[PDB]
């Protein structure tokens, strides 16, 4: 199917700072991936983002009733909708499951990677640190980064390149808004 | 920001496909099934605490269609350029033999919002228990999407997520098999 495609998008955005103390609303219109016109509550009128959007800017700005709907959106739409979902979005907290297992940088080598697998948490902000004998190890650390599962949970793998010796105790430490103190998981060679 | 809520919509010609959803910090709250004219909550529990009149989405999609006609002409019928997806296959939990898990196929950074996605087990299509999200908005105004396949890990089975998109010359297959202690 090589028929040409044409895409229109609209994004009505509500940006919240300090709860609902500061709120900014954007009414954004796109052709393919190009935003062509937008209303920003910081301004209170539509402004063309590209030349393509100039007619819409002028036309919509000429309608004061339309503009007043958009000007009141931070209150009637943004603050309202925030309130509606606050309990299961803003206040959603799901603690991570934390696993540590050995791995290999190259499959024919002996184990030289410690994987700290952090799974199922929400929201996304998390801090994961590796320790060897109570000292933080900041060298040889690599991660998948933060991964969205698409189902309101995240995961990340944080790996420490190291050669385990007998006696050594490795600790993966996890900090997250759902926890009241760091979560730690030990691994011994 | 502390949080961002976006009501994101699109309408695509000539497919005549439209979508309407709410996004909170990059996760989907709900979308409207256009055909059934029903609100679909991303998580079941969301629907017990809130509601949405699906009818409202229909009116918006109508305007989206009308605006598309206008912008199509205004642009001198300049069509969209295909942007093919990046595809990643991962599990949602560390894998243990014979312990139920879920394969995730993450399809990212593409447009237009149209793809054919197949799960393959040992090279054969499988559909038992699979699920998917609708098209999710990106800040760069491309799209992303997730597909899901519950499975029981074994040393026997291998899996692929096969993705077809107009921006791709050939279907893109991303492989998964049981990792052997490495």
């Amino acid at each position: 199917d090589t028929r040409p495609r044409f895409l229109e998008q609209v994004k009505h955005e509500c940006h919240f700072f300090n709860g609902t103390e500061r709120v900014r609303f954007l009414d954004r219109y796109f052709y393919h991936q190009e935003e062509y016109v937008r209303f920003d509550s910081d301004v209170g009128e539509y402004r063309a983002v590209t030349e393509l959007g100039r007619p819409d800017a002028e036309y919509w700005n000429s309608q004061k009733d339309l503009l007043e709907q958009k000007r009141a959106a931070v209150d009637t739409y943004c603050r309202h909708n925030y309130g509606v979902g606050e309990s299961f979005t803003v206040q959603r907290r799901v603690y991570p499951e934390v696993t540590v297992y050995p791995a290999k940088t190259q499959p024919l080598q002996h184990h030289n990677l410690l994987v700290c697998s952090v799974n199922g948490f929400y929201p996304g902000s998390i801090e994961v640190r590796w320790f060897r004998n109570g000292q933080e190890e900041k060298t040889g650390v690599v991660s998948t980064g933060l991964i969205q599962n698409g189902d309101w949970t995240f995961q990340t793998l944080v790996m420490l390149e190291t050669v385990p010796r007998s006696g050594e105790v490795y600790t993966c430490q996890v900090e997250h808004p759902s926890l009241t103190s760091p979560l730690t998981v030990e691994w011994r060679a | 920001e502390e949080h961002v809520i976006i009501q994101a919509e699109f309408y695509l010609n000539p497919d005549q496909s439209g979508e309407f959803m709410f996004d909170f910090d990059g996760d989907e709250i709900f979308h409207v099934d256009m055909a059934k004219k029903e609100t679909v909550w991303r998580l079941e529990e969301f629907g017990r605490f809130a509601s949405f009149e699906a009818q409202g989405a229909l009116a918006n999609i109508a305007v989206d269609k009308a605006n598309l006609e206008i912008m199509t002409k205004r642009s001198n019928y300049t069509p969209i350029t295909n942007v093919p997806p990046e595809v990643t296959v991962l599990t949602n939990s560390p894998v243990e033999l014979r312990e139920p898990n879920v394969l995730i196929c993450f399809i990212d950074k593409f447009t237009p919002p149209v793809v054919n996605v197949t799960w393959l087990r040992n090279g054969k299509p499988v559909t038992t228990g699979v699920s998917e999200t609708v098209f999710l908005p990106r800040e760069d105004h491309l799209f992303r999407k997730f597909h899901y396949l519950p499975f029981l890990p074994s040393t026997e089975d291998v899996y692929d997520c096969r993705v077809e998109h107009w921006g791709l010359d050939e279907p893109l297959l991303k492989h998964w098999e049981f990792d052997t202690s490495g």
Partner: peptide, 13 residues
């Protein structure tokens, strides 16, 4: 409040 409100789309003409 328990009902999500829709933000209407501006139409060109």
């Amino acid at each position: 409040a328990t009902e999500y409100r829709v933000r209407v789309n501006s139409a060109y003409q």
